[PDB]
Specification:
The structure is a homotrimer. Chain A has about 270 residues and is an alpha+beta fold. Chain A has eight helices and seven strands; from the N terminus they run αααββββββααβααα.
């Protein structure tokens, strides 16, 4: 095998990125996301309780030692009183766990602040949803920019279209002229139908799905600049090597890796 | 894309019902059921450990307070009595650490206790198993009422049949007459074959599965009166508005939505 | 209810084996492996933390009891001796929280150490990945023994081939004659292409799959003798009812059953 080292290193890195229990959930399935978010919450609060209780167990042992020293010294005073003072100091030190270390709340807004995080909406066609779907990503603090990123993993089709509304004058009236989600979606379906690897039932299902609305499946807001998301999308569309890596394998891994690439970019490989 | 109120809000509510990792496992996959059951076990045991942690924290704080008062007032009868009262209260609080609370678990079993909750058996065809499956639902406290609910998901096919048996006279003998599961399954398969939207290879697998007994994939016991289960089984095959949400989407989403709709009737959406 | 009760018992045993959410992950999707690993880690952590909670709460209870007894007496040796006993028990239990004995070596492996276990690499064909996939099992302490086991569950074929390299003499020179993994893969694909039960588009995908290297999905490992893995693989190939039980059902459950039966020859079936 002539390509079992240079691209195998990147395959190992990609596998490491995909393989986790609280990161990169499946986009088209609320169940996987609900499992992963709860695993995150459980591990987080279990770690919090274990560290808090370890320090409080230290102080409970100190208090027990102080009481035992008092009992063993009564039957002289400073041998127990300084232990009690140290116990008071360490109890005060350990009891402050309300907002001691929550740095990931305010320091994580270095890239984007809260309520400005980009909105990714996940849609899918209603008759071949496992294979064909798309994301509609909306920007904030411009309120007029968005984009559409569509996938058909049955045939390995990737499509990207911006959706920005510009002021236009039709006659002596005005309008917000820019490609709309519905016509971009129908354009994607039309581009998918006239393709040489059509199953002869895949195309019929695409045509049937053309006349009806797509199926909503949720939204995923992440801490990353919208322009960075646009850069990652354009990177996914054109890079042949990224398409070779993230667009091969089991369909579940396909969608997981595609979400990972959209979230991170080219940093997932190497 | 463009739907003002109805379909959008119904799909939203359905997503919130399906956005939890506790309820509505995928019936086809016992691995997901095991994952969800273990997650439930971890949740319950950690809330028990949390209440024990709180009570242990209070008793440790009381002991440390007594020690600190002794240390800072050594160089107390009203304090000795209050310390005993606090210790007795904390011992009473920690006495119920037996976790013997079954009333909240049985609070929904006011009229539907165990061994009376209807059982549901999940079955699947051997060949196109991901798309075609069915439920055999058996009731208790009657031992005569049962039904069959079969979904072929790829073709959008739903079948409901009533397997209630009753006494019958056959010549000078008697029997328990009524529709039975085997012929119900065979008739459902026959109806599935004759749909016009086949695949000329799906039909081959389907008829090949017609000569093999179905595959048992587990049983489920839920806190629902069998009258409600029958009502939901009729509603899922009747209400096309319900089906347009439950029966449309990715397959893994679809089976969970079907189970949820059968469980809560029309409460999954709206 | 079907044909036999022994068959139903075997199926129930298999479903109980796969019922657990902590064992036998899906060999193709690393996300399931990550979720299962985090579940197992959380369960063991909660066991250890529950032990620690019991220890600390009982120690605090004993300390409070001794303090209350001393306070009541002040208003003999029983209070002094029990406090020393509690201190000794607490010290013994806290100092036993290392678990660094050589028993930990057998507490996880218990059969064979590191650099002595076989590793099973998982690959899948690039295009119809969720159906066709193979295991490359390479052992240790021989460095010249290995085997190949491939599955195509769309047309239901399983193939096995050893890749052992024996010393061979050709001319007046020597070579290490065995089987090339690429030859094994390509022969398997040639076997799959010429099956009469063809989809006429699956074959158009297999022929394309021939001329591209497969994707490396990971390398799992279980502490089992390599000869045992060979015997279990040849059991998967050359057994009838094992194939009828493992290779029929939903794809996810099928693959989980395949991995479980590779781990466990017939003990998985019961």
């Amino acid at each position: 095998t002539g390509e079992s080292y240079g691209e195998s290193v990147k395959q190992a890195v990609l596998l490491n990125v995909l393989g986790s229990g609280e990161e990169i959930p499946d986009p088209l399935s609320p169940g996987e996301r609900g499992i992963q978010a709860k695993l995150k919450e459980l591990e987080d609060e279990q770690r919090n309780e274990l560290v808090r209780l370890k320090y409080n167990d230290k102080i409970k042992e100190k208090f027990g030692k102080e009481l035992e020293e008092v009992y063993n010294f009564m039957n002289i005073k400073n041998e127990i009183l300084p232990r009690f003072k140290k116990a008071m100091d360490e109890e005060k030190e350990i009891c402050g766990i309300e907002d001691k270390v929550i740095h990931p709340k305010v320091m994580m807004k270095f890239k984007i602040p809260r309520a400005q995080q980009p909105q990714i909406h996940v849609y899918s066609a209603p008759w071949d949803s496992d294979d064909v779907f798309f994301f509609h990503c909306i920007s904030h603090h411009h309120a007029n920019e968005s984009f559409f990123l569509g996938f058909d993993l049955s045939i390995d089709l990737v499509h990207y279209e911006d959706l920005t509304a510009h002021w236009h004058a039709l006659g002596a009236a005005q309008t917000a002229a820019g490609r709309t989600l519905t016509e971009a979606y129908r354009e994607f379906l039309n581009l998918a139908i006239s393709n040489a690897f059509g199953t002869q039932m895949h195309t019929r299902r695409l045509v049937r799905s053309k006349t009806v609305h797509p199926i909503y499946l949720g939204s995923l807001h992440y801490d990353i600049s919208f322009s960075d998301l646009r850069g990652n999308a354009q990177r996914i569309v054109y890079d042949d090597e990224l398409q070779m890596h993230i667009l091969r394998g089991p369909i579940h891994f396909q969608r997981r890796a595609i979400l990972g690439a959209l979230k991170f970019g080219c940093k997932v490989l190497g």
